[PDB]
Design a protein around this ligand. Structure first.
Ligand code: HEM
Ligand code: HEM
Ligand code: CA
Lengths: 145, 148
């Protein structure tokens, strides 16, 4: 199960960096969301947010220009779209492409590192390594699909 | 044959992250084929001239073999003092502290990941162990899914 694999990867990034929230979006070539897996948010809150993300704002930027982006305050970025109603507030941000050499498929991202601290270069490098493994898994899934 | 380029990039990244984050002097991964045979060996911490002097690549012997018969993390404070230790070959840096884990997906085994000589002279920690286990699990995903 690809979804399972992806969630495991999200868990490793979130727990190892010690971020409150972690997510991964995987899209098709027309940027429709194929998979969205996450942790750190309770189910009642999920229900309140309602609609799934479409990959806009800073995530949209990460799709257009796939390279790591680390932010002290995600809302202060010029490409920030803002959160929908009921979405938990989130401040610090680290996002990287999930990809292989031939193609990028998605974005693995974390917010609100513990104790208000910004994401570090070490965190960036770690999340890239985890994302790479995801990238191979997704590339295999397409070949299989 | 050479490893798949994406696989190789991914495994080198995982080895680098593990080595950096547990503050090890040396880190390495063996990728295995059938019957736990070493197929590829990825490492960092050793200069090219020393690699030349050592010559032959590891067969995955000694303490590294325990990672396969006992699929659990192994930490040791003096690796070459272990009775299963085969010893270092000529020109190989001496190494003391060791943290090793199997690389797996479910029960299926794909290699080993291991680090030596934490830079502060200290033993590898519980946190180091958890981190290296998670990175090994990611390496397992990478190897299992790699382009044939
Ligand atoms: C728990 C992990 C999550 C993280 C780390 C996260 C992070 C983010 C971030 C960083 C933004 C950027 C807004 C901007 O550009 O200013 C965003 C927007 C958004 N989020 Fe989340 N989020 C999470 C969970 C969820 C869930 C569970 C949902 C709904 C089920 C959701 C729905 C949305 C929507 C609809 C947007 C607006 C932009 C878009 O449509 O992509 N988020 N989120
Ligand atoms: C830089 C990361 C490396 C680490 C962490 C590492 C670690 C180890 C350890 C702990 C042992 C002893 C096992 C025992 O006594 O049971 C060993 C043995 C050995 N090493 Fe390394 N080593 C590294 C690099 C290399 C390189 C670059 C070479 C060759 C160019 C090499 C060749 C060997 C060989 C031939 C043995 C003998 C056992 C066998 O063949 O498996 N090592 N290594
Ligand atoms: Ca302990």
């Amino acid at each position: 199960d690809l979804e399972a694999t992806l969630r495991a990867i999200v868990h490793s990034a979130t727990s190892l960096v010690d971020a409150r929230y972690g997510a991964m979006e995987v899209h098709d070539r027309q940027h429709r969301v194929l998979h969205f897996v996450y942790e750190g948010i309770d189910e009642e809150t999920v229900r309140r947010i309602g609609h799934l993300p479409k990959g806009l704002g800073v995530i949209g930027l990460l799709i257009e220009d796939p390279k790591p982006l680390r932010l002290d305050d995600v809302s202060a970025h010029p490409a920030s779209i803002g959160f929908p109603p009921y979405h938990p507030p989130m401040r610090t941000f680290l996002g990287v492409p999930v990809r292989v050499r031939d193609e990028s498929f998605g974005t693995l991202y974390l917010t609100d590192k513990t104790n208000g601290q910004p994401f570090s270069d070490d965190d960036e490098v770690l999340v890239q390594a985890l994302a790479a493994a995801a990238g191979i898994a997704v590339a295999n899934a397409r070949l299989y699909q």
